[PDB]
Amino acid sequence: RPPPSDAAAYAQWLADXGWAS
């Protein structure tokens, strides 16, 4: 899943390796 605009999801996104998620 690509980087989400929302601030909340953007954090968890990074935690999952961002693009590697």
Quickly list DSSP for the chain. -PPPSSHHHHHHHHHTTGGG-
Cα angle vertex 2, ends 13, 9, to 5°?
35
What is the C-alpha separation between 14 and 21, in angstroms, rounded?
A: 8
Q: Which residue has the tokens 């961002």?
A: 18
Q: Which residue has the tokens 């605009």?
A: 5
Cβ–Cβ < 8 Å for 13, 1: yes
What is the C-alpha separation between 20 and 2, in angstroms, rounded?
A: 9
Experimental method: NMR
What is the C-alpha separation between 8 and 18, in angstroms, rounded?
A: 13
Give residue 4's identity as a one-letter amino acid code: P
